[PDB]
Design a protein around this ligand. Sequence first.
Ligand SMILES: Nc1nc2c(ncn2[C@@H]2O[C@H](COP(=O)(O)OP(=O)(O)O)[C@@H](O)[C@H]2O)c(=O)[nH]1
Ligand SMILES: [Mg+2]
Length: 156
Amino acid sequence: HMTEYKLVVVGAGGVGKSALTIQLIQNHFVDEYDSYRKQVVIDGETCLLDILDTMRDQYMRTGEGFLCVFAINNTKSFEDIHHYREQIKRVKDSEDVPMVLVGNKSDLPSRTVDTKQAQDLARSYGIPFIETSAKTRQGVDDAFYTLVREIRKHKE
Ligand SMILES: Nc1nc2c(ncn2[C@@H]2O[C@H](COP(=O)(O)OP(=O)(O)O)[C@@H](O)[C@H]2O)c(=O)[nH]1
Ligand SMILES: [Mg+2]
C-alpha cells in the first residue's frame, strides 16, 4: 500500500527538534514547546513517516534513520553531536547508520558554528550536512527527504 519510514530526531535541548518536526507536519513555527505521522510523496513513492522527537528506546533500536540536530548559534550543541552519534553507533552495532547532520536556526544572526566546521564533521562521519531554519522553513523538507534517501541507500 504505502511505505513506512521510522525516523528519529536527536540532539541537545533547545536546538529546535520539535520546531523542525512541527514545521514538517503542520507548516507553522512555534516559539514555546511523542511520535508523529505524515504522508508524503518522495520520488514517486508514497511514504508514511513515523517520526520521534526525543521508555522510548524501542525507536532507538528500530529507528531506520536519524536527524542529528544542533543549532548554529549553540556551540555546546554542536560539540554534543559526537555523543548522540556514539549512542546510535552503540545501539545499531555499526558505523554505517542512515544519518543526516542538521544545522538549525540559520535565520539567527548570532552564528558561532561555521559551515566549515559542520562540513568537516559531516565529512568525517560520511553523512550529509543540511542547514535548516524551522522559523523560515529553509531546509526542512530537504533534511527529512535526504534522510529518507539515505535510508534507501542502505537496504530496501
Ligand atoms: N529563530 C529560530 N528559533 C528557533 C528555531 N528552531 C527552534 N527555535 C526556537 O528554539 C527554542 C527551542 O525549540 P524546540 O523546538 O523546543 O527545541 P528542542 O528542545 O530541541 O525540541 C524555541 O523557543 C523555538 O522557537 C529556528 O529555526 N529559528
Ligand atoms: Mg522537544
